[PDB]
Symmetry: D2
Subunit: 310 residues, 4 copies
């Protein structure tokens, strides 16, 4: 197959209609505006291709066969690598001054007319909390179908060691924290009463249910317990790669926000602020619980931590 | 106009035919291979858009009106910025293992079938020593090196009747090397004195070779030099008097032409590594602006540079 | 000179005291925390070395000799290059998980104890609106001495073409805008309800530029930084940027805005890193002037006025 | 603890003696030369801190307890991230023209830490520096430690899984039917070349000879073990070790890219280097996935140690 025919360059390298040239006088810098956005859209299609493939492995129960954990993590890492290059790609728009942009600004749509469908589809597919025709039907499917957060949440609920009749991680953890706080108290007094309130709040299921309703939490109480199990026992073979998956989900969340930030700055630069946009807020949250390592429940001769499934 | 309609996404986002899926079983990683190369081709079109516009300013004599020097420099810098991102874009291909590449390798063309027309057009347009007609035009038309060469020959201060830069420079170097040789012979018999006499005879041969027009003409014929002797003299004038207003922006242009040359080679290197990584297993000749690198490596001391009287061309533009 | 002796590696490569190891159990990741911040501090010293040198060229009147404009622009570009690498340097902190950071968090100072003097000195020296002793004296000097904004402001007031008796840029500009809006209004008067509404909005924007009293009030509210004459001079360089005399000064204004974007992007990544492990534009006016959508055909024309192509010293 | 006192900034921010300023006239650009190299040396110390800690896990036999595989991989990835930034750090030296460098060149070079790092990875000064350099050359390199560990790879044992025996049988039979398929001009020529490459993998005498000529680094058993991790990378037990091999190759590419940019910078102002050549080599054997010996799910591939 010929290079240009395999790549279908007859479509890609023939889609550059300078609106300034079409509606009057050609403005040289408008070509950079067209190519930079066409390049962003190519990478959004690849990010969607990886995200949808990983979403499928989860929805079709293939994540249960743990031979696929390398594939899932590898593809999630690739999404972060692509996202790192998209943040870098803003350096090319920087080469165009705001004075030169104003020369072709008249031949462009308002801020309303200029909005990406693929980025909206990607945000919905990851699980970011709240176009016509085929675009409107494809957007409806993104909102209807299970988000990556919902699929990861269901998977986190099945985490080994959670079962109260088996390992009973939450029961052991609560007991260890309670007993550790007793011996710590037997001995600063102001900082203890504050520290105790924070650690014990983790076991308040009613508080977590209220925070979920206020949009402050996303994961279910059982998925939150399962994520913490992977956190503490990350060195145990069974949780080594799942820890990398949680790590990657947080990294993707940081990059999604860094891209939205640079894009926002670029709009304010050429034309003249979210904090809760983190889908995996709970994964960041669990990293902040300052439980002393010597209070983490010890690991018994329980074969789950070193035996895999298929 | 709608975002996708202005960007013609109906062509761009509908040009991904996975050959594995077409000829049998779909191989997931093949989509990354298609998009990475399509993304490289989008940036090659933008690099060609900037390069051809700058080439036009030169060929149509607009470079004579110096009000355009900001435009030329700005666009040449943009080419280097885009080139910096294309070297970074290789990090995305790194996410695909050589083992996974082999799964879709059977559904692909040989090393011969896989060759970029736009990169070849770009190399020819910079001046590296229907598709067939467009390639013929790239080789026939004046390269960026040829246009820059002609422009360097018109550099003010070169004229022997006027400033006579080359005559002053040769005189200053000759007299400076004489007093340096004397200083070396004044040193008492030492190990460092014998090393200094040897390093002087080598340093003197390098600096004086700059004034051998017959040697430069011979090296041009052997493919070792690219710029004409007058363009080489003109480039050195911009180098030494870069602080003088008239040469501030032209110095940035020469700087940018060297930067582009370094990036073109770094891209060829990463691409070569990628081929040897997926298929199994730093050239100076590839530098178009070798002479601009060459002039930076002469090392003439600042106090030997001929002095400028402020009753001269260095501050009046055209 | 010996490599390690020239670089004084006996100081640099002997300044790593792991506080976890000192106060009890050594935590491996704490070495990365020490080196990453020591590396940031080396680059802050270099950014201060370039910034102070450029500030000096301005304060000591050397910017008047325009042969130094390449030097000023080159060093300002270098500050942006270094700043671009400091934003990238945050990828190294990313390699340390927040869980591992908590293992050495107990052996560290509060949010008050952890604050950079060099970054504070740099912010003050550019002109952004715990330490004691020699540090407190050096911080007082940063706030007292002329900022890079003040030095650039004074230089912008001297911009050629501003003088009312000479080129009179502001007078010409106001006249041209007023007369251009007259002919545009006439064309419109011939439904076109969106055109008449967009005209009254366009007119309000362009004419606001000539309201000196509004600019003086915005300066007081902290919304503007440059004086009205420095604001006029910056716009002169903007419109006549292609004219040889203003080619390099345009790059300088461009660089001052770029440095401002990078200073904020660094503060952003740093803030995100603190929230990850624990749970402001000085040149606002330069960004502002880029947003005025004046049609290029209304910009006052340049006849045989020798200032645009003759330099000074 | 105060920020500058914890960081010992009294040493770091007071180690800049401009030799131009000391021996006469101060040259502004010389400060950039000092800081850029001091910054490189800070990162070489961190790269050595990570590399030595990983080397210790191997020499200490702690790698046998597979709970440490996350730690080893994580630290090896960190070394590649730091290395990526050192290649980027060359953009700061680019801001200094060769003409300005010549102004301080009269008042003026090989890194001990980079030499120590090259020796510690396994790339084949006087006083305390000479003693520390001797230790780097004497002590077991990261290649030697990885080599010993690769020899213990499960599935290699002929009495057990017998990977090499199965693999040779599968390749031999697959090449027979491929040759037959061809017999029905460029394909016949490319087959004779492809067959020679794949069959050479089972020539232990050829590998032993190439090791002696400096063309190979890993022992035949470590080479067999690396290929086992390559093919069965999806199997849980080999998921993280595959990331380790991947990282060792990535570090090797970055070490070379740094040596390249450094060399270009010296010329601007004035395969043998690959330790893990074998890991690149094994990736280049174009074996079809349907020839890989199948795994019965009554095996070691899912139980850790
Ligand atoms: C067989 C299993 N993959 C078990 C499982 C669930 N969540 C996990 C988290 C980490 C490791 C394993 C799991 C499954 O239930 O899908
Ligand atoms: C008028 C002019 N632009 C002069 C010129 C030519 N080459 C140069 C190099 C540096 C500075 C100026 C020149 C011309 O002759 O085209
Ligand atoms: C001689 C001069 N440099 C003139 C000057 C002032 N501001 C400027 C802006 C752009 C160009 C020139 C100027 C001076 O008075 O400093
Ligand atoms: C118990 C063990 N760590 C097993 C081992 C050795 N080499 C390996 C390679 C990949 C996976 C496992 C191994 C050991 O014997 O070191």
């Amino acid at each position: 197959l010929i290079y240009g025919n395999y790549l279908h360059l007859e479509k890609v390298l023939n889609a550059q209609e300078l609106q300034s040239e079409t509606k009057g006088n050609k403005i040289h810098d408008e070509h950079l505006f067209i190519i930079t956005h066409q390049a962003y859209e190519l990478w959004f299609k690849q990010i969607l291709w990886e995200l949808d493939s990983v979403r499928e492995i989860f929805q079709n129960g293939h994540v249960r066969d743990e031979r696929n954990m390398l594939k899932v993590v590898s593809r999630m890492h690739r999404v972060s690598v692509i996202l790192k290059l998209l943040v870098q790609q803003f350096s090319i728009l920087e080469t165009m001054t705001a004075l030169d942009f104003n020369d072709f600004r008249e031949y462009l749509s308002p801020a309303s007319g200029f909005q990406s469908l693929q980025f909206r589809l990607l945000e919905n597919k990851i699980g970011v909390l709240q176009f016509k025709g085929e675009e409107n039907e494809l957007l409806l499917k993104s909102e209807q179908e299970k988000t990556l957060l919902e699929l990861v949440e269901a998977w986190l609920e099945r985490t080994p060691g959670l079962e109260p009749h088996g390992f009973n991680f939450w029961g052991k953890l609560e007991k260890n924290i309670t007993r550790g706080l007793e011996e710590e108290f037997i001995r600063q007094v102001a900082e203890f009463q504050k520290q105790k309130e924070v650690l014990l709040s983790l076991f308040d299921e009613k508080r977590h249910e209220h925070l979920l309703s206020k949009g402050e939490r996303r994961l279910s109480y059982r998925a939150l317990q399962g994520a913490l199990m992977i956190y503490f026992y990350r060195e145990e073979p069974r949780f080594q790669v799942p820890f990398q998956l949680l790590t990657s989900l947080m990294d993707i969340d940081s990059l999604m926000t860094k891209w939205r930030y640079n894009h926002v700055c670029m709009v304010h630069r050429m034309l003249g602020v979210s904090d809760r946009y983190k889908v995996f807020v709970d994964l960041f949250n669990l990293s902040t619980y300052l439980i002393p390592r010597h209070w983490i429940p010890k690991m018994n001769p329980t074969i789950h931590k070193f035996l895999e499934h298929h």
